[PDB]
Design a protein around this ligand. Structure first.
Ligand SMILES: [Zn+2]
Lengths: 98, 81, 24, 129, 149, 139
RNA sequence: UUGGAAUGAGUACACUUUAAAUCCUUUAACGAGGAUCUAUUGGAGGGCAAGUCUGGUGCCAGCAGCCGCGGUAAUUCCAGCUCCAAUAGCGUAUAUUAAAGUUGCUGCAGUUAAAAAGCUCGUAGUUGGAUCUUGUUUACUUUGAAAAAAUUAGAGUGUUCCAAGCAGGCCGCCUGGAUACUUCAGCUAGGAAUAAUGGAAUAGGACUCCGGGGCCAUGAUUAAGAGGGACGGCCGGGGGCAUUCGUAUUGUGCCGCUAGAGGUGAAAUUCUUGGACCGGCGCAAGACGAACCAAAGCGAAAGCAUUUGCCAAGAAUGUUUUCAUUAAUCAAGAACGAAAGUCGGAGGUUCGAAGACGAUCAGAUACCGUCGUAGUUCCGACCAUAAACGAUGCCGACUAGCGAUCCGGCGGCGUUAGACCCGCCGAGCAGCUUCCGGGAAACCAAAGUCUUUGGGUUCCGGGGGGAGUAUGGUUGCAAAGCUGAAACUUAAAGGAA
RNA sequence: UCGAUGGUACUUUCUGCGCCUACCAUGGUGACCACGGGUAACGGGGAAUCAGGGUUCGAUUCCGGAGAGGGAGCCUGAGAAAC
């Protein structure tokens, strides 16, 4: 049975796409089939932002961030629980969670 | 719309349709007399000219070829019948 | 598996050919 | 490519009747179509159709009466005789009480009843009921 | 759709219903024929002559002003090319691709596209021979194809 | 789809001609095979000499001993294994006696839980096995 | 239960029958109550009409086309009884037809059940727009002849009825021994719609003059929401070559400070007895082209992403340009066709089949780790196979709506210095809502317009195995590609839910 | 080669004809399936089964052909390659 209309990838009217490597296991995954996640986090987390700010040499220095674009294969994205299996009707929801 | 009149369509919808899909196909193009400000002779040029037309005497350039209706120069008339 | 069965078949064709060329 | 014009003419009518349309626009017209629509009109299956001249193949806007169940073509146009005409009446017509099989005979285009009264066979164009 | 392409475009000129010369066109039938001749002697093809007449001369259609077409007008005066223009441009394009394919033997797209162009050459020439436009001994060979152009 | 043309008779006739061979029933009865491999050679019955009495295990889930006889055909020398149909009729079949065997009911197919026996005994010693089972004939 | 009746089988005095007989028919005599003058053949779980009956047997013997029955209360076997079916017939085996719309013209299928070639070109083949009197060449249709009888259909006729026969009515006498069908091709006489073909274009044109004249309305249908070609401004990770940049990885020179670094679930193999790892300035080589990068673009698919230049192509759009059916799909044939693989060169940074070693395990010849050959890279020549997938041929028409998006074009407030905003048209990749409809359903605006079945056309499927095997041919350096069986075995295999 | 196709002249036959001979010509057939192979293939009128369409069968009393164990060659006669 065809489980998904897009076959699990965002490829339409296109023959081949260049692959990438999953961050957990370096395996060849198509760029559209990859479960991407652009994570923007601070270099200093909230548990340590107090000590770093009070020990700074500047009056007002904002801590930088880590702009990392993570890529995941289907298998590792589910073991890492970044995507869950949804109901047969809930799968059709293409909106990101709030 | 089960009883839409196909024999008597409104003129606002026939101009909307493609020039081939109309009830009777008719061009969306036309001719026009271009009067340059330098000379007095008027030249009958096509709207979708696609060539570089010139006035009699090589006074100036009338229009320029484009992907659609030709782009006229400054100070010219058009829309003849 | 249908692919390893296909591989066992081609490994068997290659043996039947060499056994046939010996008595050729 | 459009290898048969009577096919696309009757297909547009059959689909417009299924949608409850009042009028249908047959884009390509021909002599066979106008005489086919006339056979359907003489028996009351369609209304008055207006041929549109555009210095080309021409278009027709047929007025649908809602009395037509299905009109279709028979491709290719087989050669039909008088002894073989009853065979097509059992395969195409829905009953022996109504429905007609249009034939193109040397005497002109007519249904199977008029072709039998004139006692002349020919080729089969289509059917309607 | 296209003959050797998956495109199904509809772009094409749609002639008006009125097969009549407009009242504002003063050029007579003979005045247009003189313009066709002077443009044919300049090297313009029948498809190019009708463009200049359409733009710089207001002649929307010479088949409505004059009783015949451009190619028939040039044939009467003997100013028509030996081979037709549509076949001349199919051979010209095939020579341009084959010339490019000599100094570039690694583009298998131009090699595939050359088969398409020469397919339309042999299709079109087959039609002109049935209409006796080309002699029965005529043949398109890639060797002397550059000489016909 | 299919070709519906006025001059497509040869195309349709040749297509059906070559597609009928994909039908295993038509191909079986239109080639040299399955007729020479058939021990009867196209006959409904055949006579043979009983080589030995053999018991054939009934296939699962059933469990029994099918009383059969290894028969050598007289017409071509082929050795087949018939089946003594009725209850206890194996005792009526002597050794090296001529018996008339026929198909088991299906065209070259094994009938019932018997593995490969596709024949059955009809007569024995020129006496029908049904007459010996009912006591109306002897020997 | 009791009775008299009636009769054929049988039987013969004989006739008849026939060349002579027999048979049938006719008919004396004779011939029926257990009218013993005896109806069998297959079945009684279901399909399939008919037993919860009794006894025996106890997964035994056997039944059973199929599904199944039997392991100690068998409705299925061996039997009694009873019942059912056809009936002087009834079973069995095999071939064959219908069933089978499971061979398809009528009339099937190919998204997932078996299935559409990886993709495109292309000959034959098949099929091809509209248009010409409305108000030569053929095909086609109609008519006649022909198509031997017998058979078949069928008219007449009490062979006692009937299958048959062609004979037989009537009180010499008058009636039959008909007709229809016989494909295709050929022959004939009408029809002229539909579908092909021809006529005048360098006029060596028709009709008239009577080599030159006159004359004809003097001879070219349309310009496809078919196609080719030109042209216009564009557009695209389309292709090729040549340049160019980027950081990274590995290696290396120098400098710095240090004993650990690498790796793992945990470790070890390994790198460091010192200068590994780390930091700095560099350098060299070979790959690769991040983020931007999307259910976006392009290309026939495979496939395609740094810059710049060059080369020749391409769709779409625009067109009151040109040609005028040149078209569609395609046996044969042909171009291209990921990766891996093969051969010959160059190069081998990374990665890494094989291989080694270190872990884990009962064992790992695996997963995991440290290396590492071929390979991965480039050039030329092969290979031609992928879950080459949208598991869905191509062309064309039609049948809903909506918001977006890519390209081109078009006209409209306004903002900005083309960008944005609002619509429309054509082209395309998609999305969604719908009781359009379809389907076994999942699902599908096509997988719809399908028992209300026929637009054109190619390839291809026929239970599951055997088996893409055997053999033959062909292709290749090879690996293997293409074509491709049968014996035999099996009652399911499988799809969706 | 040693007739395949055609032309010319014979020869021969009951006659036309590469039927045959001699001299020339290089043809003739084929994906519209030639050639080759198989047929448990005599052909047909017909039979069975069939809503239509079909499928299958036709050694078998009628017609035509063929053969008389296998080939081949002849006699006689109007007529036979006869059993
Ligand atoms: Zn992963």
């Amino acid at each position: 049975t065809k489980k998904r209309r897009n076959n699990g990838r965002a490829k339409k009217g296109r023959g081949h796409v260049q692959p990438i490597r999953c961050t957990n296991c370096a395996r060849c995954v198509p760029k559209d089939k990859a479960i991407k996640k652009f994570v923007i986090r601070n270099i200093v987390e909230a548990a340590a932002v107090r000590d770093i700010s009070e020990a700074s040499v500047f009056d007002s220095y904002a801590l930088p961030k880590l702009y990392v674009k993570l890529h995941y294969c289907v298998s590792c994205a589910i073991h890492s629980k970044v995507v869950r299996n949804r109901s047969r009707e809930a799968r059709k929801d293409r909106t990101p969670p709030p | 719309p089960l009883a839409k009149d196909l024999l008597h369509p409104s003129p606002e919808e026939e101009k909307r349709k493609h020039k081939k899909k109309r009830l009777v196909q008719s061009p969306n193009s036309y001719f026009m007399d271009v009067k340059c400000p330098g000379c007095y002779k008027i030249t009958t040029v096509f709207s979708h000219a696609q060539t570089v037309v010139l006035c009699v005497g090589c006074s100036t350039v009338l229009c320029q070829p484009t992907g659609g209706k030709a782009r006229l120069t400054e100070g010219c008339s058009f829309r003849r019948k | 598996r249908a692919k390893w069965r296909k591989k066992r078949m081609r490994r068997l064709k290659r043996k039947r050919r060499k056994m046939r060329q010996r008595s050729k | 490519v459009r290898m048969n014009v009577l096919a696309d003419a009757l297909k547009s009518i059959n689909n417009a009747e299924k949608r409850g349309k009042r009028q249908v626009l047959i884009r390509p017209c021909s002599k066979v179509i106008v005489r086919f629509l006339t056979v359907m009109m003489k028996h009351g299956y369609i209304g008055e159709f207006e041929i549109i001249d555009d210095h080309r193949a021409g278009k027709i806007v047929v007025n649908l009466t809602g009395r037509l169940n299905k009109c279709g073509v028979i491709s290719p146009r087989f050669d039909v005789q008088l002894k073989d005409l009853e065979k097509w009446q059992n395969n195409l017509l829905p009953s022996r009480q109504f429905g007609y099989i249009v034939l193109t005979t040397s005497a002109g285009i007519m249904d199977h009843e008029e072709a039998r009264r004139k006692h002349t066979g020919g080729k089969i164009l289509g059917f309607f009921f | 759709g296209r003959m050797h392409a998956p495109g199904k475009g509809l772009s094409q000129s749609a002639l008006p219903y009125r097969r009549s010369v407009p009242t504002w066109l003063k050029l007579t039938s003979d005045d247009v024929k003189e313009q066709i001749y002077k443009l044919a002697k300049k090297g313009l093809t029948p498809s190019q002559i009708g463009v200049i007449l359409r733009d710089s001369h207001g002649v929307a259609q010479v088949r409505f002003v004059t009783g015949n077409k451009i190619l028939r007008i040039l044939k009467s005066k003997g100013l028509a090319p030996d081979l037709p223009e549509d076949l001349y441009h199919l051979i010209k394009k095939a020579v341009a691709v084959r010339k490019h394919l000599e100094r570039n033997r690694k583009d298998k797209d131009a090699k595939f596209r050359l088969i398409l162009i020469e397919s339309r050459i042999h299709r079109l020439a087959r039609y002109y021979k049935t209409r006796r436009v080309l002699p029965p001994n005529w043949k398109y060979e890639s060797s002397t194809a550059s000489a016909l152009v | 789809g299919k070709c519906r043309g006025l001059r497509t008779a040869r195309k349709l006739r040749n297509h059906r001609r070559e597609q009928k061979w994909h039908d295993k029933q038509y191909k079986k009865a239109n080639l040299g095979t399955a007729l020479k491999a058939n021990p009867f050679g196209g006959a409904s019955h055949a006579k043979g000499i009983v080589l030995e009495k053999v018991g054939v295990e009934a296939k699962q889930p059933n469990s029994a001993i099918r009383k059969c006889v290894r028969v050598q055909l007289i017409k071509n020398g082929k050795k087949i294994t018939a089946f003594v149909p009725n209850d206890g009729c194996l005792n009526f079949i002597e050794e090296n006696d001529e018996v008339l065997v026929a198909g088991f009911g299906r065209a070259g197919h094994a009938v019932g839980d018997i593995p490969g026996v596709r024949f059955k005994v009809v007569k024995v010693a020129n006496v029908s096995l049904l007459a010996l089972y009912k006591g109306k004939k002897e020997r």
